Design a protein around this nucleic acid. Sequence first.
RNA 1: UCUCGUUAAGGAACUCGGCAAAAUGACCCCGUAACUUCGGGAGAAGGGGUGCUGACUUCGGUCAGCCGCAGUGAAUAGGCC
RNA 2: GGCACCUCGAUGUCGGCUCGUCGCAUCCUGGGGCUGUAGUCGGUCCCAAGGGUUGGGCUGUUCGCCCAUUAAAGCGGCACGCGAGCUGGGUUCAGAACGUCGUGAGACAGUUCGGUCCCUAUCCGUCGCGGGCGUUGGAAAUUUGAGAGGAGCUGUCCUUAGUACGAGAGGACCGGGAUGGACUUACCGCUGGUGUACCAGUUGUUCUGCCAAGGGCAUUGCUGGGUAGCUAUGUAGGGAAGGGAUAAACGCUGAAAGCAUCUAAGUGUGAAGCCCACCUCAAGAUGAGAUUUCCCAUUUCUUUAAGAAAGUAAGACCCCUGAGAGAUGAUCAGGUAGAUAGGUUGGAAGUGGAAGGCUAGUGAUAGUUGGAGCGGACCAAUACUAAUCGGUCGAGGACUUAAC
Lengths: 122, 56, 114, 207, 123
Amino acid sequence: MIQQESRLRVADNSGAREILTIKVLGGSGRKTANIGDVIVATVKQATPGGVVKKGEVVKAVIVRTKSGARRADGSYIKFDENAAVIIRDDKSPRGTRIFGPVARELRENNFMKIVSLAPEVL
Amino acid sequence: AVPARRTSKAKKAKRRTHYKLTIKGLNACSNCGEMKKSHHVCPACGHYDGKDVMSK
Amino acid sequence: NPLIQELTQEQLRTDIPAFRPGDTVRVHAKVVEGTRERIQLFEGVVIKRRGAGISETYTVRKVSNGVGVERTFPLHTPRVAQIEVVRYGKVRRAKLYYLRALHGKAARIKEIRR
Amino acid sequence: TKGILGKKVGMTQIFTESGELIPVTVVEATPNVVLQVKTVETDGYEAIQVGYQDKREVLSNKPAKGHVAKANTAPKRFIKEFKNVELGEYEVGKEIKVDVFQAGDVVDVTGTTKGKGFQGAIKRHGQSRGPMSHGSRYHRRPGSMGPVAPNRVFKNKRLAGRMGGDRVTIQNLEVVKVDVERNVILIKGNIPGAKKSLITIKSAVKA
Amino acid sequence: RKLGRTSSQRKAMLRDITTDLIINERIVTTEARAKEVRSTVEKMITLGKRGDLHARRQAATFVRNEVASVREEDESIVVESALQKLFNDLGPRFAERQGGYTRILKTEPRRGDAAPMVVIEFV
RNA sequence: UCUCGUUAAGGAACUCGGCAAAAUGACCCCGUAACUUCGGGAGAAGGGGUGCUGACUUCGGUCAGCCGCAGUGAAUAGGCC
RNA sequence: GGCACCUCGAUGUCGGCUCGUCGCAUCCUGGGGCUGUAGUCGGUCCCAAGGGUUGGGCUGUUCGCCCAUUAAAGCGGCACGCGAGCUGGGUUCAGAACGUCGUGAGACAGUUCGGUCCCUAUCCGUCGCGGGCGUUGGAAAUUUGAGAGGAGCUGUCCUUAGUACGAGAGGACCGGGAUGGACUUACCGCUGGUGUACCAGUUGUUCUGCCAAGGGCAUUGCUGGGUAGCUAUGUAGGGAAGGGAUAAACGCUGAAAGCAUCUAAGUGUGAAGCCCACCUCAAGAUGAGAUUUCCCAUUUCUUUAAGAAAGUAAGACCCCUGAGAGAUGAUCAGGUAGAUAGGUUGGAAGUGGAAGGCUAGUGAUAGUUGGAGCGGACCAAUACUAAUCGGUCGAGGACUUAAC
Ligand SMILES: [Zn+2]
């Protein structure tokens, strides 16, 4: 459940800290978005330096929502925060380091170049 | 809103037909043969189920 | 109620030990990658219990790299190999929801040698 | 063709052979005697009467016990028909156990919905309230009734009136088990009806 | 259940009615209060069958605190506080009778509201 | 329809306008900018402590220990830039 | 824009909200002809109204400019739809001010701040639900379907195939498969919400003679959990595959016109559209349908007629215990040939360690007796209480003609 006007967090070493969504690409009027769905957002806060700054339009992906997916077996995951990791239209991140665990549901979406950097893949 | 006409004499009745007052469930008591209400204590006899109840 | 129980006995695992909310519990899960079968190890604090019979459940609260995580499993799965209590903690509630706002040196539960 | 009535006990879960929980309801049944065979030359079509439960004896009357006793059973509670069934193949007073649905895997349960009494115009159609603040006074009503030109109200404007209590069928559900020793089926998903209601199960229509 | 007022008012009304009908063994009220009070009274007489502390200290919250009942004297004034009655007289009078010890009798409506009245007894 | 109580995830996307609701609110302690008619702004902002038992109380309080998810444990009692 | 027939014993304006509906001069999806159509794209014209047609920033806004998506972000009618359904911001009251005009009192489709929107549904209309009678003997059940309603949307990926195509550049038709968006039908086993006669902690003050134990009041006193029930953001499924007759278009065969030519006679293909296919209502369908089973005859005469009256069969109702139902009535489960409700004995969800004792401590408190005590709707078992005794209604089956 993450929709317009909501604030993610950057879980990357790219230069951005917060973020505010814009759209939920995929569909003709979708409302929400869950783990592993792409997104359009524009930086709000930023650290000095970095390749990313305020007022930039960027695409990101949703890692570790605060009401996580269901496992087909019958288990669930429910983190404490929300987070995103910036992307270059080829599922390839911009930053070069990732903090905080990531849920497994990415391996099913060719987001490999991410999982190989996550410290924990739950 | 507010009526647009007086109701005729007929419509008055034709609507009041379902305004009745029916009494139902009248039984013959068993100690004095008088009419009493089923499942209810007999007021004059005082009895019920062939037994006395209202006593002190 | 009685007609269902008779329909749901053959699938009640029967080696689950005793553990009440507030006992650190190591969980040998089952993972699936490619054409393999690894075994993860999720290991936290028992928080919850939904008393239900065939479908009782429980939850565990880990903290990895400063980000809380929780998983809940059905009590009678075939895709969990083993469970093993590790400790026993003094606790007076049956639902320890009040932990998600506590960190580190404030969310420790005293041990009990029983 | 394959048709069986039965009760409705409740819902529980079941693991399959690959570690996958599955919601499952418990349609219970009992044997049931075919009561009458309607033919073309007599009744204009072909169908089969069935009945799934047993009354006491106090709770019937001579027509019922004279209409059943041509098959020698205790008088039944429910009586229904079935069509498109290959007639043949049958007799007055046979039985229909739960065998016929071994792993049919495609089935169309029907039944009677729940009951919800007089209801508003939002719990029946998903009509949306009006702004609950900013000074409005239009919280929870059914909107307007149409235009002015026609000097009447078009048909099929929807507003309050009893919700629920009419039959409905679902299609293309699977079947999980058949415990003939207790006459119980187990299907996947949600099935309509109140507990202890009356349910019917036939083979799929969409092949 | 059947509400009649707010919560606490109903609770007080029942804690009232079942404290009579302990002292008189008979009561003439309406129909609904009758049903709820038969439930409550029968539920507060099994406590008269244990007689220990815990049953005492659990019954001692659903009974009007102090309502004397004095028909006795040898050379004295013996007072019975309508709970001591519960644990001295009603109790030992029901040892073999199992649940269900009240009779309800539908008599006649009332003058001003036509509320069909009713009686309640014990045997 | 009116008068009240509670809510997952999101937190002004509603709307003419955050109207309405929500949030702060007591006592003690630390600390507090531009600006100025030098009096003020100032309760600016932003923070910390409060329960019970024993000991010592110089006097105020300090030490030690105990329990709860929460210690002006209920009602009364500034939202800020 | 014109006219001034219409309404001055009062016919209320723009936008936005809830709710729709209809036309097609069509925005997307569907079928086609031509191309200055190699392919992928495209341009135009034709047939076609089945469904679908977004969130936000700025102004009172219609209009419009912009950002981000999408298959697409259509144009119009319905008092420029809808105020006895909502708002009243806007333009049109009384206050006040600026610029300009007037000598003045005042004025300005110039501007700025503030400002009272009443109504208990009689008739028709729409949404649901009963009573009366009819259907030609009285009753219990099961169905046919003349008709009506619902439903109709679509993307992306993979393979066919790096093929046909093309110098390269780039890159398919027709098929097969997986998975989504919106919309929508049912349900509570999972995740969550609620849960005021369930369990625990804790403040004040007052009451039960006191300590211990408890009640009353303070938004349910406040806080932490939470059963049944009702629930969506949760779960499961749905628009699948086909047939018949047609639209634009394309033919086959064939002449009037020794040829050519789809047409007049003959004979075909062809679309999300028409009619079936899928789901529901339905014999008040007064053209009142069909089938299985059940019950079979007193008194006088009005005068024997489709006569009147009385007692019954089958059955139904009244009355009472209730809920899987419920505004009332109705539907359903039962009424001693009994588990319908209450109660009682077990059990479960749920809280989370009762009271009284004992041990350790100066004391707060802690340990043990003990997964304890309590336990509204839930699951079993038992006639202890209550469904007693009773009462009312309810047929005796017309005629004509043919056949047998
Ligand atoms: Zn009598």
